[PDB]
Amino acid sequence: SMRKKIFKPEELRQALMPTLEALYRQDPESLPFRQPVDPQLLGIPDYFDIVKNPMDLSTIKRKLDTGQYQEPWQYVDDVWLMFNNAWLYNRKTSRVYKFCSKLAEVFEQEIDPVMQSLG
Numbered sequence: 791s792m793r794k795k796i797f798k799p800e801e802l803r804q805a806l807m808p809t810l811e812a813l814y815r816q817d818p819e820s821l822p823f824r825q826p827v828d829p830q831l832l833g834i835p836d837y838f839d840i841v842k843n844p845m846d847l848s849t850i851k852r853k854l855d856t857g858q859y860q861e862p863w864q865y866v867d868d869v870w871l872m873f874n875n876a877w878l879y880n881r882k883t884s885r886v887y888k889f890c891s892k893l894a895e896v897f898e899q900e901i902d903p904v905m906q907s908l909g
């Protein structure tokens with residue numbers, strides 16, 4: 791037989807939310823990622839020409855809090871979208887690129903045992 795695993799939204803929140811919280815706890819590194827990029831406010835007006843699909847911690851949080859992920863990989867893909875956006879837009883030598891790299895490191899550490907537990 792073949793049975794597709796079903797994940798209830800609270801199941802996903804309780805497993806995955808802690809991994810998001812681990813990123814929020816990183817200070818100063820998470821501060822640029824805690825709200826959607828506002829190009830006008832930040833003085834970076836080319837941002838949306840380069841980044842077509844914006845993502846940030848508050849959006850991911852919202853989606854986890856309101857049951858918008860069906861599968862663990864959907865949550866993971868949004869986290870990587872947020873990081874890949876920042877690695878794409880910002881220069882390798884920049885503060886925000888280096889902050890992104892630190893958050894990705896923390897994320898890789900936290901997510902692996904969670905993915906194993908979710909199966």
Ligand SMILES: CN1Cc2ccccc2NC1=O
Binds near residue numbers: 832834
């Ligand atoms: C996620 N952010 C936020 C940000 C804040 C300040 C300067 C550059 C950026 N670029 C980004 O990619």
Ligand SMILES: [K+]
Binds near residue numbers: 878
């Ligand atoms: K880049």
